[PDB]
Automatic annotation (TrEMBL), chains A, B:
Single GO BP term: L-proline biosynthetic process
Native source organism of the sequence: Neisseria meningitidis serogroup B (strain ATCC BAA-335 / MC58)
Ranges of residues in domain Pyrroline-5-carboxylate reductase dimerisation: 154-258
Domain of life: Bacteria
Pyrroline-5-carboxylate reductase catalytic N-terminal domain location: 3-90
Gene: proC
Protein name (Swiss-Prot/TrEMBL): Pyrroline-5-carboxylate reductase
Primary localization class, coarse: cytoplasm
Pathway the protein contributes to: Amino-acid biosynthesis; L-proline biosynthesis; L-proline from L-glutamate 5-semialdehyde: step 1/1
Subcellular location: Cytoplasm
Length: 263, 263
């Protein structure tokens, strides 16, 4: 089964590397500039070319160009009924169907950067008209880089963006926050980084392995009048959790606005 | 080499399980109530008893009782020059030396709960008088559950507590924060938990694998006028990173106060 990529950028390369590891697909990447055609061939050993060859209905096409460049990138593509996946932000299935000349055989994907290392989260959406077998084919492709989360409502793709899409940035910000607090406590940069990292990694691992409710995990290690209680009270006083949700809302609002530019 | 534990509680059991996995030690746990002597034997297969047998200078003793119960727990213990490690909060090496009748062969440890799964962080402190070989022996024991971080100043043990000791609670709080924001965006509880978890785990893994500066990782995936920028601006406006450091300071202040109860 041929999996063509339109665009050979970072997300395309993650998904391509994912598929290579999974085995069983024929990967082919269309990308104009030689620079990164050179890279993918050297590193992944995948086929590349400046343009797409003729497509057929048994192929998969993954659209992976920047959203502002998508309409023109698709201008003369004849999908010939191929299954289309899009990883581009802000372009709805309806818009995509327009750009491609009318086809409805489209699955939208909202992947995130930890997919580069096989720990991704990808939101997935298809209109009702898209068959269960096409969903499963797209689902398997995106599982090659991590978890998939199917959505009932295309609107929720903005929610995905606000949580797992932009979410890695939040975690980096919070890792930096704990690392800076350690510096304030007298740790050198190397120690502060190591402490913040190992703290996050270990706590996240406990939450994963236990499967326990996050608030319960927190409450379980917070004794009244204890040291942890003092810190969590400060967090609460400063409405940290609430600020996080506010940042998420601001992210979602913006995703929504950006999508209006093309629709 | 005998490693005796005074106290068979959660941290003692983590360290004991660590040592079992490492191989090469003889583990023996003194703990009054049978209840958890029963558990450790069934689960870890380690020797237990209500009290300690005679100690010798080639043994290690790990003090793992609650700090308020330590003085009396140590009242009649004759260490006979054994190497002592303490995992108890708020009891300084000087205080420990008093409780034990004068011995200075003491290494203090400030471990954290992810050591239960081999992903711990343990702060370490010994007075200058403690030999490099004794440091290495204590260092190897605590590496059985994770990372060790040696400190020049005993005071920094409060810093450890504010960062990696209480730190897992902060991460649970932040995991819960992202999970609640997902709920607000229309995700059911199962999806919200999975999204928050995978987001944290994947971002933390990227930071680990890249070794890149956290702020740089964040800045690298935050484009001007983009969705992520809107969320991070909100975080900044609400001084989230600063609130985190304030909570850390509050934690450290309290650790310090609590330590004054025994000193």
């Amino acid at each position: 089964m041929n999996v063509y990529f339109l665009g050979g950028g970072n997300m395309a390369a993650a998904v391509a590397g994912g598929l290579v590891k999974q085995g069983g697909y024929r990967i082919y990447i269309a990308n104009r500039g030689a620079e990164k055609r050179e890279r993918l061939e050297k590193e992944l050993g995948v086929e590349t070319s400046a343009t797409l060859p003729e497509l057929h209905s048994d192929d998969v096409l993954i659209l992976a160009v920047k959203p502002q460049d998508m309409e023109a990138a698709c201008k003369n593509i004849r999908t010939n009924g191929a299954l289309v996946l899009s990883v581009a932000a802000g372009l709805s299935v309806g818009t995509l169907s327009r750009y491609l000349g009318g086809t409805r055989r489209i699955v939208r994907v909202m992947p995130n950067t930890p997919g580069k290392i096989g720990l991704g989260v990808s939101g997935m959406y298809a209109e009702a008209e898209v068959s269960e077998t096409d969903r499963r084919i797209a689902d398997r492709i995106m599982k090659s880089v991590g978890l998939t989360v199917w959505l009932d409502d295309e609107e929720k793709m903005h929610g995905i963006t606000g949580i797992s899409g932009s979410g890695p940035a939040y975690v980096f910000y919070l890792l930096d926050a704990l690392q800076n607090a350690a510096i304030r406590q007298g740790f050198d940069m190397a120690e502060a980084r190591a402490l913040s990292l190992a703290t996050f990694k270990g706590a996240v691992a406990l939450a994963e392995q236990t499967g326990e409710d996050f608030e319960k995990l927190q409450k379980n290690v917070t004794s009244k009048g204890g040291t942890t209680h003092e810190a969590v009270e400060a967090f609460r006083r400063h409405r940290v959790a609430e600020a996080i949700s506010e940042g998420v809302c601001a992210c979602v609002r913006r995703s929504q606005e950006m999508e209006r530019q093309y629709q």
